[PDB]
Design an enzyme around this catalytic site. Structure first.
Site, short mmCIF file in Angstrom:
data_model
loop_
_atom_site.label_atom_id
_atom_site.label_comp_id
_atom_site.label_asym_id
_atom_site.label_seq_id
_atom_site.Cartn_x
_atom_site.Cartn_y
_atom_site.Cartn_z
N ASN A 115 13.67 -0.92 -0.64
CA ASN A 115 13.65 -0.88 0.81
C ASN A 115 12.33 -1.35 1.40
OD1 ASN A 115 12.02 1.42 2.40
ND2 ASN A 115 12.45 2.16 0.32
N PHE A 119 8.92 1.89 8.42
CA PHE A 119 8.69 3.06 9.26
C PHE A 119 9.37 2.94 10.62
CE2 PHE A 119 5.34 3.20 6.15
CZ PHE A 119 5.33 4.55 5.82
N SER A 184 0.40 6.05 0.66
CA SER A 184 1.31 5.49 -0.35
C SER A 184 2.52 4.62 0.04
CB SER A 184 1.88 6.64 -1.18
OG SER A 184 2.76 7.48 -0.46
N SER A 185 2.85 4.47 1.32
CA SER A 185 4.01 3.63 1.61
C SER A 185 3.71 2.14 1.44
CB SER A 185 4.52 3.86 3.01
OG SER A 185 5.64 3.03 3.26
N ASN A 187 5.20 -0.49 2.84
CA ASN A 187 5.74 -1.34 3.90
C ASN A 187 5.02 -1.22 5.24
OD1 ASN A 187 7.80 -1.88 1.94
ND2 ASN A 187 8.81 0.00 2.62
N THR A 188 3.75 -0.83 5.19
CA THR A 188 2.88 -0.90 6.35
C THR A 188 1.53 -1.46 5.90
OG1 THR A 188 3.86 0.72 7.87
CG2 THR A 188 1.47 0.52 7.93
N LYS A 225 0.97 12.54 -0.02
CA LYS A 225 1.97 11.83 -0.82
C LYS A 225 1.40 10.51 -1.30
CE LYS A 225 6.78 10.31 -0.87
NZ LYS A 225 8.07 10.44 -0.15
N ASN A 254 5.86 8.36 -4.04
CA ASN A 254 6.56 7.38 -3.21
C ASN A 254 7.17 6.29 -4.09
OD1 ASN A 254 7.36 5.91 -0.82
ND2 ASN A 254 5.56 6.78 0.22
C1 LIG Z 1 15.54 3.89 1.88
C2 LIG Z 1 14.31 4.72 1.58
C3 LIG Z 1 13.50 5.10 2.63
C4 LIG Z 1 12.36 5.87 2.40
N1 LIG Z 1 11.55 6.24 3.46
C5 LIG Z 1 10.43 7.02 3.24
C6 LIG Z 1 9.62 7.44 4.31
O1 LIG Z 1 9.88 7.17 5.50
N2 LIG Z 1 8.51 8.18 4.03
C7 LIG Z 1 8.19 8.56 2.74
O2 LIG Z 1 7.20 9.24 2.50
N3 LIG Z 1 8.99 8.15 1.70
C8 LIG Z 1 10.10 7.39 1.94
N4 LIG Z 1 10.89 7.01 0.88
C9 LIG Z 1 10.50 7.42 -0.52
C10 LIG Z 1 11.25 8.65 -1.01
O3 LIG Z 1 10.82 9.75 -0.22
C11 LIG Z 1 10.92 8.94 -2.47
O4 LIG Z 1 9.52 9.20 -2.56
C12 LIG Z 1 11.28 7.77 -3.39
O5 LIG Z 1 12.43 7.09 -2.93
C13 LIG Z 1 11.51 8.20 -4.84
O6 LIG Z 1 12.56 9.13 -4.96
P1 LIG Z 1 14.03 8.67 -5.45
O7 LIG Z 1 13.85 7.80 -6.67
O8 LIG Z 1 14.77 9.94 -5.76
O9 LIG Z 1 14.67 7.92 -4.28
C14 LIG Z 1 12.03 6.25 1.11
C15 LIG Z 1 12.85 5.87 0.05
C16 LIG Z 1 13.98 5.10 0.28
C17 LIG Z 1 14.83 4.72 -0.90
O1 LIG Z 2 9.88 3.20 6.02
C1 LIG Z 2 9.71 2.55 4.99
O2 LIG Z 2 9.77 1.36 4.67
C2 LIG Z 2 9.22 3.41 3.70
C3 LIG Z 2 8.21 4.37 3.91
C4 LIG Z 2 7.76 5.09 2.67
O3 LIG Z 2 6.88 5.95 2.75
N1 LIG Z 2 8.34 4.73 1.48
C5 LIG Z 2 9.31 3.79 1.29
O4 LIG Z 2 9.84 3.44 0.25
N2 LIG Z 2 9.71 3.11 2.54
#
Ligand SMILES: Cc1cc2nc3c(=O)[nH]c(=O)nc-3n(C[C@H](O)[C@H](O)[C@H](O)COP(=O)(O)O)c2cc1C
Ligand SMILES: O=C(O)c1cc(=O)[nH]c(=O)[nH]1
Ligand SMILES: CN(C)c1cccc(-c2c(F)cc(-n3nnc4c3C(=O)c3ccccc3C4=O)cc2F)c1
Ligand SMILES: CCCCCCCCCCCC[N+](C)(C)[O-]
Ligand code: NA
Ligand code: NA
Ligand code: NA
Length: 365
Positions: A115, A119, A184-185, A187-188, A225, A254
């Site tokens: 993804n 944000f 850690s994200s 995409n910013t 995070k 993340n």
């Molecule tokens: C579609 C998508 C959107 C996410 N958005 C955020 C987000 O806004 N903020 C954040 O801290 N992590 C975000 N994450 C990360 C998840 O919180 C998690 O850390 C990561 O996906 C690993 O867990 P998983 O393998 O069980 O999905 C996102 C993940 C996915 C797949």
């Molecule tokens: O909003 C997103 O693109 C996003 C935020 C984040 O913290 N982690 C992630 O995988 N996507």
């Protein structure tokens, strides 16, 4: 239980995925969940799944990770799904649309997702009012062992990242059991560079000051995070700052901007964060390292590629007090929550643990 699990995994979820692109499917999932359209989980949480950490009781250690319910629209539905705790967000100060579509991609051959949402957020004010509408309901849930976390982001155009996070603390801190700040994200632009030490100390000092300025019953725990993509130096520095400042916990991890060898999905080279099974052990190892670097004194919420009791227990034994999942939901559907809890309970018994608490960090001993 096992009936619904097989039906969702073998028939329903593959069919939904065939009909709906990933972002549409995500939106539908949030809508169903917010409406409570799901089987009220038959799995009764046992006492050995209870965890006391971050100043709260957690009825079970399996939470929904940030990014599923970005805008706080489905919190009660998520508790109904059987999650022991819910994390909403990331929420940015001002509303913003995020990246152009398409921005979410399935890698079914890898049980992964990529993804680059960027944000997308309704913003602090909207989410504030949404949580206020159920503030006392949440107070009761929290007292009953079902806490709420809020993940705080920053706007794309922000000039001062620390002030964005400070605003989030002030506005949503009073409504949260814990707050999360990402270093850690993927995409910013420039967000992860908040991982550098002296500046990281500055940022987190400001966040903690704002938190400490809230009235006692409105004063949340603060967690950081992190991504799995950190250098050894980065991890040392974060562990040091976290201990120095008294940060309450870590969320590990993340998504990854790495692409592990062996991915098969046609969309493997899309830009974005990779989640799901290819992240699993990278996350677990990051938990292991951060637990050791903080001498096991800093609670860790472990996240990345969890879809079974084994996955959950590996993260707990590596050092996690709690775990989260997200991507498994997109492949297994809601029944995955009860599955993980049931399998985790069984494994704890099989390995001679009295409960989750006994297993936390067990690999290090
Ligand atoms: C579609 C998508 C959107 C996410 N958005 C955020 C987000 O806004 N903020 C954040 O801290 N992590 C975000 N994450 C990360 C998840 O919180 C998690 O850390 C990561 O996906 C690993 O867990 P998983 O393998 O069980 O999905 C996102 C993940 C996915 C797949
Ligand atoms: O909003 C997103 O693109 C996003 C935020 C984040 O913290 N982690 C992630 O995988 N996507
Ligand atoms: C049948 N019922 C009652 C029911 C109730 C409650 C929820 C669901 C539910 C679900 F949990 C997941 C999905 N889903 N399918 N493909 C994807 C998803 C995602 O949620 C998703 C999220 C983020 C990135 C990507 C995806 C993604 O690709 C679709 C659903 F309808 C279903
Ligand atoms: C050590 C680097 C490994 C990179 C990623 C490892 C993925 C492990 C594969 C098991 C996942 C299960 N499945 C069905 C999705 O293939
Ligand atoms: Na509340
Ligand atoms: Na509080
Ligand atoms: Na290094």
């Amino acid at each position: 239980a096992t009936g619904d699990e097989r039906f969702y995994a073998e028939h329903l979820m593959p069919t939904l995925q065939g009909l709906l692109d990933p972002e549409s499917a995500h939106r539908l999932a949030v809508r169903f969940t917010s409406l409570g359209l799901l089987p009220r989980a038959r799995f009764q949480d046992s006492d050995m799944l209870e965890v006391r950490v971050l100043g709260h009781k957690f009825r079970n250690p399996v939470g929904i990770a940030a990014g599923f319910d970005k805008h706080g629209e489905a919190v009660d539905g998520l508790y109904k799904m059987g999650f022991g705790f819910v994390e909403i967000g990331s929420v940015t100060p001002k509303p913003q649309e995020g990246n152009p579509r398409p921005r979410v991609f399935r890698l079914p051959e890898d049980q992964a997702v990529i993804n680059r949402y960027g944000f997308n957020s309704h913003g602090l004010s909207v989410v504030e009012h949404r949580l206020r509408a159920r503030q006392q309901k949440q107070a009761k849930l929290t007292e009953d062992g079902l806490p709420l976390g809020v993940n705080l982001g920053k706007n794309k155009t922000s000039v001062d990242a620390a002030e964005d996070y400070a605003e989030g603390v002030r506005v949503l801190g009073p409504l949260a059991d814990y707050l999360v700040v990402n270093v850690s994200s993927p995409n910013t632009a420039g967000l992860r560079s908040l991982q550098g030490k002296a500046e990281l100390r500055r940022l987190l000092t400001k966040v903690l000051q704002e938190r400490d300025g809230l009235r006692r019953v409105h004063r949340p725990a603060v967690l950081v995070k992190i991504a799995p993509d950190l250098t050894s130096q980065d991890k040392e520095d974060i562990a040091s700052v976290v201990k120095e400042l008294g940060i309450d916990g870590l969320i590990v991890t993340n998504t990854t901007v790495s692409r592990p060898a062996g991915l098969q999905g046609a969309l493997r080279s899309e830009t974005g964060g990779l989640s799901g099974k290819p992240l699993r052990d990278l996350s677990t190892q990051t938990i292991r390292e951060m637990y050791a670097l903080t001498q096991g004194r800093v609670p860790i919420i472990g996240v990345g590629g969890v879809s079974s009791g084994q996955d959950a227990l590996e993260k707990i034994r590596a050092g996690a007090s709690l775990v989260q999942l997200y991507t498994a939901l997109t492949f297994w559907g809601p029944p995955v929550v009860g599955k993980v809890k049931r399998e985790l309970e069984a494994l704890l018994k099989e390995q001679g643990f009295g409960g989750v608490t006994d297993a936390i960090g067990a690999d290090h001993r």
